[PDB]
Amino acid sequence: IXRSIPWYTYRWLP
Amino acid sequence: TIXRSIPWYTYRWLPN
Amino acid sequence: AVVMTQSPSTLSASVGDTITITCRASQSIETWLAWYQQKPGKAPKLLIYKASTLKTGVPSRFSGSGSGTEFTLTISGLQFDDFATYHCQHYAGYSATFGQGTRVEIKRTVAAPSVFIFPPSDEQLKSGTASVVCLLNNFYPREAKVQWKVDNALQSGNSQESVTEQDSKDSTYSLSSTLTLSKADYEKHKVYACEVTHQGLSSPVTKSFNRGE
Amino acid sequence: AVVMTQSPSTLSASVGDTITITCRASQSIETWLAWYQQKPGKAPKLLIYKASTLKTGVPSRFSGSGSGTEFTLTISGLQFDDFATYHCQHYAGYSATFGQGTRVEIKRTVAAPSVFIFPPSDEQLKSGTASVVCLLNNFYPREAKVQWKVDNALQSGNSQESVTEQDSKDSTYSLSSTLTLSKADYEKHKVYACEVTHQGLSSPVTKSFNRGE
Amino acid sequence: EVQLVESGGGLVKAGGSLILSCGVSNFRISAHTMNWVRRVPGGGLEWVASISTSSTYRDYADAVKGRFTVSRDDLEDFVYLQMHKMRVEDTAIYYCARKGSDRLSDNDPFDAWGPGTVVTVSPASTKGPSVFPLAPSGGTAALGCLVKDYFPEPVTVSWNSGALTSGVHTFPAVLQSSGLYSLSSVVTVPSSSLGTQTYICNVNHKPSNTKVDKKVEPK
Amino acid sequence: EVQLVESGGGLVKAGGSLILSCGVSNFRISAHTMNWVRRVPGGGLEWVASISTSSTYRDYADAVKGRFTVSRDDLEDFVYLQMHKMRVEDTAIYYCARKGSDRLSDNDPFDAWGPGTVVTVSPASTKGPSVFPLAPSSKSTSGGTAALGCLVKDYFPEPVTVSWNSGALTSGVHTFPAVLQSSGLYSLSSVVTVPSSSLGTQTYICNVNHKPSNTKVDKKVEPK
Ligand SMILES: *[C@@H]1O[C@H](CO[C@H]2O[C@H](CO[C@H]3O[C@H](CO)[C@@H](O)[C@H](O)[C@@H]3O[C@H]3O[C@H](CO)[C@@H](O)[C@H](O)[C@@H]3O)[C@@H](O)[C@H](O[C@H]3O[C@H](CO)[C@@H](O)[C@H](O)[C@@H]3O[C@H]3O[C@H](CO)[C@@H](O)[C@H](O)[C@@H]3O)[C@@H]2O)[C@@H](O)[C@H](O[C@H]2O[C@H](CO)[C@@H](O)[C@H](O)[C@@H]2O[C@H]2O[C@H](CO)[C@@H](O)[C@H](O)[C@@H]2O[C@H]2O[C@H](CO)[C@@H](O)[C@H](O)[C@@H]2O)[C@@H]1O
Ligand SMILES: *[C@@H]1O[C@H](CO[C@H]2O[C@H](CO[C@H]3O[C@H](CO)[C@@H](O)[C@H](O)[C@@H]3O[C@H]3O[C@H](CO)[C@@H](O)[C@H](O)[C@@H]3O)[C@@H](O)[C@H](O[C@H]3O[C@H](CO)[C@@H](O)[C@H](O)[C@@H]3O)[C@@H]2O)[C@@H](O)[C@H](O[C@H]2O[C@H](CO)[C@@H](O)[C@H](O)[C@@H]2O[C@H]2O[C@H](CO)[C@@H](O)[C@H](O)[C@@H]2O)[C@@H]1O
């Protein structure tokens, strides 16, 4: 899952 | 007609 | 606005006993009723739902019955680990209502408290604060009333209480009440007293001291 | 990964002047740059976006230019209302970066502070606390440093300070530092000193007192 | 397997605000109606709020209706509770709880709970300042008032009912580690006026309707 | 007039957690990317976090990545910032800010801001207790028994352990649940009842251990 805590794992780049 | 919680509770639905 | 009323509020029993907590609703809730166990400082645990269904893992000594307006939780062969607070709950899709809770405690004979009062230490006083402490020692049942009076004026809003859990050895409770005043306030008065009311005392006990001795 | 560098950090000028604030980007950001105004204790206010477009309500004395890596905010005919902090900003769809900010102030000649030290009042001491206050009065520019010493031992973590906005009459600043100790600690020591460093002084100034005297 | 954890509990003054959050492990909240429950000092549980799937319907206990709002963040699995206009009787341990069963139905019990987070509301919503002299002790003298331990902002300070404005500096307040504010107001005057001219700072703390006049003399 | 209002700020101990919210007036947040920005003591602004429309994309300043989370509530128009594992340098004024313009585009500036809420992280994660005697006296002595104790005051966080005479004295001891004072600091008492006949011959010392600050205190409790 794309999450913020405790690790930032979003992979999309604007 | 926006349902809100604060500062007034204005939800209108009643569970069945 | 359904009212859920548990009974009794405190249930005193012994290990191996069979006990029954009742929950009554002010109007019919069919079987939409759940029971929860909760121990001090810990999260509620679901025991029973839909009035009589036991959650997997829950010992068969726990049993729920009832419907409409009257519900019961029965524990057969009460074990030490069963001493805790039990809550009934009416649950609907988007809301719930709880009973006031029932605390199951170890049964014993009524015992009046021993009462002690402690003036503030000189060391604390010098630092600008006066804590006055009232101790109620080893009493049973837990319900007790403590009122502070400063020169006979009943105090409100300036004290905090703390109660111990049931003592492992004599099954009694103890309580501490602290009255907190500024150094300056404290020095405006003479007589400090705590007045204790309890079912085991023939009448209230008042312990007091005069500031400065 | 885009670093925004604003220059200068402080810009001293006079009413009627034309001034320029620079913003530099570590790499080309085309014209995706905004300028904001912020007054003390207030929210930022957007002035210019897309490098050169003024928001509605923004006076024409404000203008912006630049593209790529070098950007400029110009104010032609400084008015009193314009003294404030200005922030540049690279904005992207889902992120942004700000420059360090540029404080625009009224220019005047350097002025050394008058320094005063105040012992705790007897009243406060009686209540258990000891605040020692050091006042740096009517100095310019705003940068100043205060060091507390107790029996010649430098202090840390036990003092706070605040600074006034530029004075209406002499365009100077003043600063207040409060050293806070318990009555107990305060009475362990004799010499309390605040040491002040500021460009208007040839060297650091110390004001001190001996407790009791 | 299933876990819930609350964050955000704390001590707040009456009338204040506090926001709580709830995170989870080993399930997604999306299919679950999520709830807030509190255990009051008396020992009983109180249902506080419910937030249904898709966030379409929200219901609150009467005692908090109009003051509390519950929110959910399905993509990252968080639930929030905003509490405003808080009262002493809001003091409690707050739990995040889900409605659930092995197969989800239109009405399941609270099958999973967080450990809880302690929320404490102190009774006083304001506190007036203590005022202390900053006593003077050549040619140019300095004196002032130390306005200490108040809440919330602001206070205003005038000198000699306003007649004295020149040389006055009232500093921004600082927030002490105690959570109370403190500021000082000072005025500079001729060392030759100490004991001829009277100096009185007038402190006003509108929030607690408190006014305090304090004479600053030497020694 | 478009308006934003932050809620939630205050004092936090290092390592602690705090959650902020943001509410609005006279517009709906749904079409807007929403942002958190902070002004640090030095006066500069720092971008903290952004959350796109539909909560599709979330981005964070490197300094807070892994510790902060931003969330939105489009139906009731709220934005949230969760702050965990807080550091002193998180100390700042936090503003809620809207990305927007007269007509929306793929990249607009922050055209509306909240007034800001103050968040202050103190360096101290812990504080050690003061310990005061609850001295035995005529007011605490009746017949064959006397009560005495220690008041363990103004510490943080829980817990503290209390033993009497290094563990030799356990019978009759009661150490009460701590209470949280309006100061945000805890306090508790530990008491013990002993024979009145033992005061003056037997010494009594409460041993207080505050593990969270690794602080230890031994306090002699004597008559008068
Ligand atoms: C107001 O909005 C309500 C929507 O609220 C959301 O919740 C719905 C319920 O979700 C819970 O329960 C279901 C199972 O019942 C689970 O799948 C969920 O995971 C969720 O479980 C969690 O909550 C419950 C309750 O607290 C707990 O017990 C659980 O433990 C757990 O925590 C949910 O369905 C709903 O989503 C649908 O609708 C949204 C729009 O409102 C939309 O955003 C979604 O995409 C989704 O729409 C699709 O999915 C449904 C399900 O297949 C389809 O029906 C749709 O057409 C779409 O395909 C929300 O997320 C909603 O419940 C209300 O609707 C009831 O009342 C209105 C008018 O009052 C009617 O128009 C509805 O038909 C519905 O009435 C039915 O449901 C009630 C209980 O669910 C019954 O009491 C009613 O009598 C009636 O049931 C009959 O009719 C149905 C159709 O005729 C039939 O399928 C049933 O079997 C019965 O015969 C209202 O719109
Ligand atoms: C992955 O997700 C992203 C994010 O989608 C979300 O935002 C979309 C953009 O919304 C903002 O911009 C619009 C105009 O550009 C405004 O109308 C809107 O109100 C938003 O404005 C706010 O935000 C901007 C930016 O921060 C700010 O400047 C404004 O001031 C406002 O603050 C939006 O369109 C999405 O909604 C749609 O999709 C969602 C799906 O979740 C639906 O729920 C919704 O109902 C609606 O259909 C969403 O809210 C998204 O942008 C991406 O899509 C683009 O890229 C993918 C590939 O990555 C393509 O498939 C797609 O077609 C989109 O872009 C194409 O065009 C660009 C040219 O700009 C081209 O460069 C690109 O290569 C593609 O060809 C992706 O789904």
Side-chain angles (χ1 to χ4, degrees):
Chain A
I1 319 311
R3 297 192 183 277
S4 303
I5 60 177
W7 301 279
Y8 183 85
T9 51
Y10 285 79
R11 272 177 299 180
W12 184 63
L13 300 165
Chain B
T1 302
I2 315 308
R4 297 192 183 277
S5 303
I6 57 176
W8 301 279
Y9 183 85
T10 65
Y11 285 82
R12 301 310 172 210
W13 184 61
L14 300 165
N16 9 34
Chain C
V2 177
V3 187
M4 304 292 288
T5 298
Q6 286 181 231
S7 155
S9 302
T10 301
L11 186 167
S12 311
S14 323
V15 164
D17 287 349
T18 289
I19 61 171
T20 300
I21 299 178
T22 296
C23 188
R24 180 200 300 284
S26 59
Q27 67 202 141
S28 176
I29 60 178
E30 290 162 18
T31 51
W32 297 115
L33 185 82
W35 289 96
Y36 300 84
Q37 180 191 70
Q38 185 174 29
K39 292 173 167 199
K42 304 299 169 105
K45 180 182 181 222
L46 177 57
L47 300 179
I48 292 164
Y49 59 98
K50 209 80 172 310
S52 60
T53 305
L54 208 48
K55 193 176 178 172
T56 303
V58 177
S60 56
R61 65 170 179 281
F62 292 97
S63 178
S65 307
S67 176
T69 48
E70 299 166 319
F71 304 85
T72 65
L73 167 64
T74 301
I75 310 177
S76 302
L78 191 62
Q79 302 185 6
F80 183 66
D81 201 69
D82 302 335
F83 294 108
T85 298
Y86 295 87
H87 313 282
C88 65
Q89 178 204 41
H90 169 43
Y91 58 100
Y94 307 108
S95 61
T97 314
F98 292 89
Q100 80 274 13
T102 298
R103 197 173 53 90
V104 181
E105 69 171 355
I106 295 151
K107 190 168 155 297
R108 62 147 296 145
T109 48
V110 173
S114 287
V115 190
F116 305 100
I117 192 166
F118 297 97
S121 67
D122 288 290
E123 181 184 341
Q124 178 182 36
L125 209 44
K126 182 158 180 76
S127 80
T129 298
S131 289
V132 190
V133 172
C134 190
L135 169 68
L136 283 56
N137 209 54
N138 293 344
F139 57 94
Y140 180 94
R142 187 167 183 261
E143 307 85 79
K145 180 182 49 173
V146 180
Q147 292 183 299
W148 288 98
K149 290 174 290 181
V150 185
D151 289 331
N152 288 322
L154 175 60
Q155 300 300 287
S156 279
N158 53 3
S159 64
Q160 302 191 98
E161 303 188 345
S162 185
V163 190
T164 62
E165 278 261 273
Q166 198 156 32
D167 184 88
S168 61
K169 302 178 275 289
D170 53 25
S171 296
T172 62
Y173 301 93
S174 289
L175 178 160
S176 181
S177 180
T178 308
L179 178 72
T180 304
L181 296 187
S182 61
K183 179 171 180 297
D185 283 337
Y186 177 75
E187 290 176 342
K188 295 180 190 170
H189 305 98
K190 188 62 41 164
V191 188
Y192 285 83
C194 63
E195 181 189 308
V196 172
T197 301
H198 186 272
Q199 168 186 350
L201 286 165
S202 297
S203 47
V205 169
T206 296
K207 301 297 295 195
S208 68
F209 67 91
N210 295 314
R211 180 176 60 73
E213 286 187 331
Chain D
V2 171
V3 168
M4 301 301 300
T5 299
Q6 203 167 332
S7 155
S9 294
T10 295
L11 203 163
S12 317
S14 307
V15 168
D17 291 348
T18 295
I19 61 175
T20 55
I21 301 183
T22 277
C23 189
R24 167 181 292 281
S26 56
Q27 71 183 41
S28 174
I29 56 179
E30 302 185 272
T31 55
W32 305 118
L33 186 105
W35 292 96
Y36 301 82
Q37 175 190 73
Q38 186 175 25
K39 279 169 179 197
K42 297 295 186 259
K45 192 200 171 274
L46 174 62
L47 298 187
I48 291 169
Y49 64 103
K50 201 82 173 306
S52 68
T53 302
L54 276 65
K55 211 58 183 167
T56 306
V58 178
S60 56
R61 66 182 175 276
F62 287 92
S63 61
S65 65
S67 63
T69 62
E70 296 160 359
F71 303 86
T72 300
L73 172 68
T74 295
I75 307 182
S76 300
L78 216 37
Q79 299 180 14
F80 285 102
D81 205 68
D82 302 335
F83 296 103
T85 297
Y86 295 86
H87 303 288
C88 68
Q89 184 214 30
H90 169 227
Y91 56 97
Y94 309 103
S95 63
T97 65
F98 291 90
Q100 53 276 46
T102 298
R103 186 169 63 85
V104 177
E105 69 172 351
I106 297 149
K107 189 189 224 301
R108 57 150 292 144
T109 56
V110 169
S114 291
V115 186
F116 304 95
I117 187 169
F118 301 99
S121 68
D122 288 323
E123 176 184 2
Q124 182 188 25
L125 262 180
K126 183 158 179 52
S127 62
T129 297
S131 304
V132 193
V133 171
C134 189
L135 166 67
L136 289 51
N137 194 58
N138 293 31
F139 60 84
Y140 180 96
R142 206 184 89 101
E143 295 68 51
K145 185 177 78 168
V146 169
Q147 295 197 99
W148 286 98
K149 293 175 186 163
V150 176
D151 290 335
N152 199 35
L154 176 60
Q155 297 301 284
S156 315
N158 53 4
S159 72
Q160 301 184 281
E161 62 177 44
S162 72
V163 176
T164 57
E165 300 181 54
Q166 207 169 12
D167 183 272
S168 60
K169 305 186 273 292
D170 67 358
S171 307
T172 61
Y173 302 85
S174 299
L175 177 159
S176 178
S177 180
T178 302
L179 173 66
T180 288
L181 302 168
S182 62
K183 182 188 179 288
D185 294 319
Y186 178 72
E187 294 171 344
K188 277 160 206 169
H189 299 103
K190 183 189 159 93
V191 192
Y192 290 81
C194 66
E195 191 197 53
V196 170
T197 297
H198 184 278
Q199 305 160 245
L201 307 161
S202 59
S203 57
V205 178
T206 296
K207 294 300 178 192
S208 63
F209 67 83
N210 303 310
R211 177 183 51 82
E213 304 180 353
Chain E
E1 283 308 302
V2 164
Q3 285 179 80
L4 282 91
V5 54
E6 308 84 357
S7 295
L11 176 53
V12 56
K13 287 128 189 183
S17 286
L18 185 70
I19 324 288
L20 308 184
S21 67
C22 168
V24 306
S25 299
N26 302 314
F27 75 103
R28 309 305 302 257
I29 66 173
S30 71
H32 295 274
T33 292
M34 302 290 299
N35 305 262
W36 287 96
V37 177
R38 61 186 187 190
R39 179 177 206 185
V40 290
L45 302 178
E46 294 174 353
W47 170 72
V48 172
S50 295
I51 177 151
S52 75
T53 54
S54 300
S55 299
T56 45
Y57 185 66
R58 315 186 192 208
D59 199 8
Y60 306 84
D62 280 13
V64 310
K65 197 172 285 148
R67 305 187 298 111
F68 290 12
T69 201
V70 55
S71 296
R72 65 186 301 137
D73 173 9
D74 287 350
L75 296 187
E76 293 203 347
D77 295 297
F78 294 111
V79 182
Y80 295 93
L81 185 65
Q82 306 181 34
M83 308 188 278
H84 305 289
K85 306 302 180 208
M86 298 186 69
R87 310 170 177 165
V88 173
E89 57 267 36
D90 295 322
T91 297
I93 305 175
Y94 285 69
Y95 312 90
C96 173
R98 90 173 184 186
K99 285 172 76 75
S101 188
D102 290 325
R103 179 188 176 151
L104 302 182
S105 74
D106 59 355
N107 190 31
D108 300 314
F110 295 177
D111 72 343
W113 300 64
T117 190
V118 179
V119 171
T120 304
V121 180
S122 56
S125 68
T126 73
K127 158 170 186 35
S130 295
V131 184
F132 304 107
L134 294 164
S137 65
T140 66
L143 62 80
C145 286
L146 176 56
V147 181
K148 190 154 159 62
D149 292 337
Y150 64 90
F151 182 98
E153 301 196 86
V155 281
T156 50
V157 185
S158 60
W159 281 91
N160 293 0
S161 298
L164 186 51
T165 48
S166 295
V168 174
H169 295 304
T170 298
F171 294 88
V174 290
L175 179 59
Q176 317 174 71
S177 59
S178 63
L180 303 178
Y181 295 95
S182 181
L183 73 70
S184 56
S185 180
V186 302
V187 61
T188 35
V189 304
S191 285
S192 82
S193 73
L194 318 171
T196 198
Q197 190 47 37
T198 289
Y199 296 112
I200 300 172
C201 80
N202 325 99
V203 178
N204 199 345
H205 188 226
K206 271 323 179 183
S208 71
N209 289 287
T210 305
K211 308 191 182 179
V212 183
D213 287 9
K214 194 81 176 198
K215 215 181 87 171
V216 184
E217 53 201 355
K219 147 153 214 124
Chain F
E1 183 178 2
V2 164
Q3 257 181 15
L4 290 82
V5 57
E6 300 81 2
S7 278
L11 270 160
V12 204
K13 309 136 213 187
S17 285
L18 186 69
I19 313 172
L20 305 180
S21 63
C22 170
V24 311
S25 301
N26 296 316
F27 75 102
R28 310 300 307 280
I29 67 169
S30 54
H32 298 275
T33 288
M34 298 296 289
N35 292 266
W36 288 96
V37 177
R38 62 187 186 187
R39 191 184 202 178
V40 299
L45 294 182
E46 287 184 354
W47 172 74
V48 174
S50 169
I51 183 168
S52 74
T53 53
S54 302
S55 295
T56 305
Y57 188 63
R58 310 183 200 217
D59 199 8
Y60 301 96
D62 277 16
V64 308
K65 210 179 298 241
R67 308 189 291 111
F68 292 8
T69 299
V70 58
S71 300
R72 65 188 299 142
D73 179 353
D74 286 346
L75 290 173
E76 304 202 347
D77 300 279
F78 298 113
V79 192
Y80 294 96
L81 185 64
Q82 296 185 47
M83 299 183 294
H84 301 284
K85 294 182 173 199
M86 296 217 242
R87 314 178 171 156
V88 170
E89 63 268 27
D90 284 326
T91 292
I93 299 157
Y94 285 80
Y95 313 87
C96 170
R98 167 178 96 171
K99 203 170 167 73
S101 200
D102 298 293
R103 183 166 180 163
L104 305 183
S105 70
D106 284 18
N107 195 31
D108 299 317
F110 297 0
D111 68 349
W113 302 60
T117 180
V118 176
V119 176
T120 294
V121 184
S122 69
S125 57
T126 70
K127 181 191 200 298
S130 303
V131 183
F132 300 108
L134 299 170
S137 67
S138 58
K139 314 288 170 172
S140 66
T141 290
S142 179
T145 69
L148 58 92
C150 280
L151 175 56
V152 185
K153 204 175 189 298
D154 297 343
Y155 64 95
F156 182 94
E158 302 215 75
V160 300
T161 52
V162 177
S163 74
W164 284 92
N165 293 353
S166 302
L169 177 55
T170 57
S171 279
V173 176
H174 290 305
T175 297
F176 295 94
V179 296
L180 181 60
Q181 304 172 100
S182 56
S183 58
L185 302 173
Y186 295 94
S187 71
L188 66 67
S189 269
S190 180
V191 306
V192 56
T193 50
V194 305
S196 64
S197 93
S198 62
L199 326 169
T201 184
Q202 176 73 54
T203 298
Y204 293 103
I205 296 160
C206 69
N207 314 119
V208 184
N209 194 201
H210 193 215
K211 273 318 183 182
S213 73
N214 193 23
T215 292
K216 282 182 187 164
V217 175
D218 288 317
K219 195 65 183 210
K220 185 148 76 179
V221 177
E222 49 191 38
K224 198 174 149 58

